[PDB]
Design an enzyme around this catalytic site. Structure first.
Site, PDB file in Angstrom:
ATOM      1  CB  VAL A 137       1.785   8.956  10.737  1.00  0.00           C
ATOM      2  CG1 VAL A 137       2.515   9.857   9.738  1.00  0.00           C
ATOM      3  CG2 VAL A 137       0.926   9.801  11.665  1.00  0.00           C
ATOM      4  CG  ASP A 193       5.614   8.696  11.461  1.00  0.00           C
ATOM      5  OD1 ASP A 193       6.049   9.111  10.369  1.00  0.00           O
ATOM      6  OD2 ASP A 193       5.283   7.503  11.639  1.00  0.00           O
ATOM      7  CG  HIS A 200      12.766  26.160  17.367  1.00  0.00           C
ATOM      8  ND1 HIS A 200      13.871  25.861  16.603  1.00  0.00           N
ATOM      9  CD2 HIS A 200      12.201  27.253  16.804  1.00  0.00           C
ATOM     10  CE1 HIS A 200      13.992  26.759  15.644  1.00  0.00           C
ATOM     11  NE2 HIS A 200      12.991  27.614  15.743  1.00  0.00           N
ATOM     12  CD1 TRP A 342      18.123  31.033  14.313  1.00  0.00           C
ATOM     13  CD2 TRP A 342      17.193  32.282  12.716  1.00  0.00           C
ATOM     14  NE1 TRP A 342      17.364  31.989  14.925  1.00  0.00           N
ATOM     15  CE2 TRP A 342      16.787  32.773  13.966  1.00  0.00           C
ATOM     16  CE3 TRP A 342      16.713  32.907  11.560  1.00  0.00           C
ATOM     17  CZ2 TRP A 342      15.959  33.887  14.101  1.00  0.00           C
ATOM     18  CZ3 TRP A 342      15.900  33.996  11.693  1.00  0.00           C
ATOM     19  CH2 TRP A 342      15.536  34.487  12.961  1.00  0.00           C
ATOM     20  CG  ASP A 366      10.420  30.774   3.121  1.00  0.00           C
ATOM     21  OD1 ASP A 366      10.617  31.938   2.689  1.00  0.00           O
ATOM     22  OD2 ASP A 366      10.355  30.539   4.341  1.00  0.00           O
ATOM     23  CG  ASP A 373      16.305  33.230   7.787  1.00  0.00           C
ATOM     24  OD1 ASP A 373      16.071  34.214   8.510  1.00  0.00           O
ATOM     25  OD2 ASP A 373      15.435  32.537   7.233  1.00  0.00           O
ATOM     26  CB  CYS A 396      15.402  35.778   4.933  1.00  0.00           C
ATOM     27  SG  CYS A 396      13.721  35.924   5.549  1.00  0.00           S
TER      28      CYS A 396
HETATM   29  C1  LIG Z   1      12.929  36.451   9.187  1.00  0.00           C
HETATM   30  C2  LIG Z   1      12.050  35.255   8.953  1.00  0.00           C
HETATM   31  O1  LIG Z   1      10.880  35.246   9.337  1.00  0.00           O
HETATM   32  N1  LIG Z   1      12.688  34.239   8.337  1.00  0.00           N
HETATM   33  C3  LIG Z   1      12.093  32.941   8.048  1.00  0.00           C
HETATM   34  C4  LIG Z   1      12.638  31.854   8.993  1.00  0.00           C
HETATM   35  O2  LIG Z   1      11.920  31.916  10.240  1.00  0.00           O
HETATM   36  C5  LIG Z   1      12.642  31.896  11.493  1.00  0.00           C
HETATM   37  O3  LIG Z   1      13.134  30.596  11.789  1.00  0.00           O
HETATM   38  C6  LIG Z   1      13.839  30.493  12.993  1.00  0.00           C
HETATM   39  C7  LIG Z   1      14.445  29.102  12.960  1.00  0.00           C
HETATM   40  O4  LIG Z   1      15.563  29.050  13.852  1.00  0.00           O
HETATM   41  C8  LIG Z   1      12.878  30.761  14.131  1.00  0.00           C
HETATM   42  O5  LIG Z   1      11.792  29.825  14.112  1.00  0.00           O
HETATM   43  C9  LIG Z   1      12.360  32.172  13.963  1.00  0.00           C
HETATM   44  O6  LIG Z   1      11.493  32.401  15.063  1.00  0.00           O
HETATM   45  C10 LIG Z   1      11.674  32.308  12.590  1.00  0.00           C
HETATM   46  O7  LIG Z   1      11.225  33.616  12.217  1.00  0.00           O
HETATM   47  C11 LIG Z   1      12.447  30.459   8.439  1.00  0.00           C
HETATM   48  O8  LIG Z   1      11.068  30.109   8.493  1.00  0.00           O
HETATM   49  C12 LIG Z   1      12.921  30.409   6.997  1.00  0.00           C
HETATM   50  C13 LIG Z   1      12.871  29.003   6.401  1.00  0.00           C
HETATM   51  O9  LIG Z   1      11.568  28.732   5.875  1.00  0.00           O
HETATM   52  O10 LIG Z   1      12.121  31.305   6.222  1.00  0.00           O
HETATM   53  C14 LIG Z   1      12.249  32.691   6.552  1.00  0.00           C
HETATM   54  O11 LIG Z   1      11.207  33.444   5.895  1.00  0.00           O
HETATM   55 CA   LIG Z   2       4.721   5.622   9.790  1.00  0.00          CA
END
Ligand SMILES: CC(=O)N[C@@H]1[C@@H](O[C@@H]2O[C@H](CO)[C@H](O)[C@H](O)[C@H]2O)[C@@H](O)[C@@H](CO)O[C@H]1O
Ligand SMILES: [Ca+2]
Ligand SMILES: [Ca+2]
EC number: 3.2.1.140
Length: 582
Positions: A137, A193, A200, A342, A366, A373, A396
């Site tokens: 990669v 990579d 998560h 978050w 996004d 958020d 959000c």
């Molecule tokens: C409400 C929503 O969907 N918000 C988005 C964020 O998504 C959340 O992220 C947390 C991270 O701890 C977790 O994965 C959760 O399950 C997700 O819905 C996140 O993606 C943010 C940044 O791009 O965008 C929001 O739209």
């Molecule tokens: Ca590499």
């Protein structure tokens, strides 16, 4: 306590450590006794050392307040930081398991990790360079551009969804107890990579997370887990560069104990006791540089009153696009923001800079600098956003509430400065200076929800008096304005009966638009004062209809006004926008 020593060109593992004259060759011998360190113990690797197919793991131990355990370097910096480069060999790999559902995300599997800190308290890691590089990669950020054809530029990616997750630094609490007083200082974590998709897993430059120690199988386990919580206290990451990683740049606090935190969402606000017990306290993210993460730059998850300050984010969401994010499965996440919280409570983002969040043009749903958020009380203040692909700030959805966004500067942020898609109530945008070019506007096309704009300087940086859409939607009382300066616009909001119209931005500010276009070569924040101050452009001029024209403001979320973008005190009648003028 003791102090062992390591040198990749000298040492000889059949040595003894203990003295600088007599060090070890590889990290084999250090893994061997890591778990027996040691308050006041230390391990040090000689600047210039290059440890390949190697790693440092460290489990179930502690220093104390008197004396931390210390992992670091020794003697003549101008040699190269010592490089640990696992290359994701088997020995770096461990079995991650949250032992609980934590959303639609892979929550269990094999993870390669260059430096793992598994329930290690009172420790400090320092002056180390860390890779977790795949040789197969290669897609560096310094050279990255959008191409008609994927991988057509001598670059190569593994878009496999089941690709193994990789960390630079993983911090893991899975004993049902607090991991505390951990400190990451310097560190150049780069070429990690990992998996393009997974939000998560310990997958990224630096990720700290908590797991249940056992899977919750009964009433009696639920009783136990409610009172014995894996969690972090007094974590501090600072002065570090995270560059060219997949997926997250820096993430701290995602916890299996969200099954308790998110049990009753309703209304959206977050009880203090709950976040203090189940979440992670005294987290500081400080003076770091995130460049070219595959996904998000910096995120605080499930954190009680974290402090995110003096950091620079730059050119992230590199792999958040249609060319690279090809196998999302049922998980989604083709979506990233810069520096954000978050489900935190009353966090504070301040004195940060965010440049060029990427690919909102190419499938990133996004693309904002900042993202209040889900969660409660988010504070953004004294931050500069520039040139991001979709907005400065998002607020959000339904459970993002009680935001204050203040004394900040947006410059050339694109497709709208403020993104308000169905956000909850209680948000207060005030005293910000926003430079809005022809690629942008004030609100994103999809905005439909609450905010209260007051004391802002809205600047139309196009060549014509613009008629703007200042209102879309009416969810949670829509956008209401009062006491804002509108510059070079053909109109104002029907809801601001205390408007301050101006005609030319040159009679209002010193030199608008002249803030920086890129992070400094170094990764440091820009000077705000003295010889190299790079925000002078935004100081009002002698005779600005911006001086003394803000109403004193009752921050909706009980946040005490204190200073302006530049940090000089704000007493008396507040000067419109984010700068006050000497
Ligand atoms: C409400 C929503 O969907 N918000 C988005 C964020 O998504 C959340 O992220 C947390 C991270 O701890 C977790 O994965 C959760 O399950 C997700 O819905 C996140 O993606 C943010 C940044 O791009 O965008 C929001 O739209
Ligand atoms: Ca590499
Ligand atoms: Ca590419």
């Amino acid at each position: 306590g003791t102090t062992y020593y390591v040198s990749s060109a000298h040492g000889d593992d059949a040595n003894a450590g203990t003295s600088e004259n007599a060090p070890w060759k590889s990290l084999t011998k250090v893994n061997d006794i890591a778990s027996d360190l040691g308050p006041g113990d230390s391990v040090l690797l000689e600047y210039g050392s290059e440890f390949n197919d190697q790693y440092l793991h460290i489990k179930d131990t502690a220093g104390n307040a008197d004396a931390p355990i210390t992992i670091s370097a020794y003697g003549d910096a101008d040699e190269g930081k010592p490089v640990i480069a696992s290359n994701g060999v088997k020995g770096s790999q461990w079995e991650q398991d949250y032992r609980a559902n934590v959303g639609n995300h892979k929550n269990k599997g094999t993870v390669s990790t260059t430096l793992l800190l598994k329930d290690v308290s009172y420790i400090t890691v320092s002056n180390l360079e860390i890779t977790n590089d795949d040789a197969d990669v290669y897609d560096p950020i310094d050279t990255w551009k959008w191409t008609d054809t994927p991988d057509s530029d001598g670059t190569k990616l593994d878009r496999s969804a089941s690709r193994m997750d990789r960390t630079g630094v993983a911090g893991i609490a899975e004993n049902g107890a607090t991991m505390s007083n951990v400190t990451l200082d310097n560190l150049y974590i780069h070429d990690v990579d990992g998996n393009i998709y997974n939000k998560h897993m310990a997958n990224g430059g630096i990720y700290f997370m908590a797991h249940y120690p056992m899977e919750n199988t009964s009433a009696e386990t639920d009783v136990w887990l409610r009172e014995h919580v894996s969690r972090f206290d007094h974590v501090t990451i600072r002065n570090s560069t995270v560059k060219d990683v997949d997926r997250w740049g820096i993430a701290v606090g995602y916890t299996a104990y969200l099954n308790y935190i998110d049990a009753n969402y309703g209304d959206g606000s977050i009880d203090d006791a709950l976040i203090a017990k189940y979440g992670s306290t005294n987290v500081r993210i400080e003076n770091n540089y995130v460049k070219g993460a595959g996904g998000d730059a910096i995120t605080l998850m499930y954190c009680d009153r974290p402090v995110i300050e003096h950091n620079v984010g730059d050119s992230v969401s590199k792999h958040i696009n249609t060319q690279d994010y090809t196998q999302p499965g049922s998980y989604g996440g083709r979506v990233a923001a810069g520096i954000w919280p978050w489900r935190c409570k009353d966090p504070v983002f301040q004195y940060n800079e965010m440049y060029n969040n990427l690919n909102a043009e190419h499938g990133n749903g996004d693309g904002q600098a900042w993202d209040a958020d889900y969660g409660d009380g988010t504070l953004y203040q004294y931050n500069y956003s520039y040139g991001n692909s979709f907005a400065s700030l998002m607020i959000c959805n339904w459970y993002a509430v009680n935001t204050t966004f203040r004394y900040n500067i947006s410059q050339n942020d694109r497709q709208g400065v403020f993104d308000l898609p169905s956000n909850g109530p209680g948000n207060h945008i005030y005293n910000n200076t926003v430079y809005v070019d022809a690629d942008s506007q004030v609100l994103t096309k999809r905005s439909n929800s609450q905010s209260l704009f007051e004391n802002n300087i809205f600047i139309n940086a196009t060549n014509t008096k613009k008629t703007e859409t200042w209102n879309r939607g009416s969810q949670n009382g829509g956008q209401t304005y009062d006491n804002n300066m509108y510059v070079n616009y053909a109109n104002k909001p029907t809801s601001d009966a205390n408007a301050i119209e101006a005609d030319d931005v040159s009679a209002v500010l010193a030199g608008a638009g002249s803030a920086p276009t890129s992070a400094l070569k170094s990764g440091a924040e820009h000077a705000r004062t003295g010889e190299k101050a790079a925000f002078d452009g935004y100081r009002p001029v002698a005779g600005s209809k911006a001086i003394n024209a803000g109403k004193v403001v009752s921050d909706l979320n009980d946040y005490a006004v204190e200073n302006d973008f530049l940090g000089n005190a704000v007493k008396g009648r507040p000067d419109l926008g984010a700068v006050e003028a000497a």
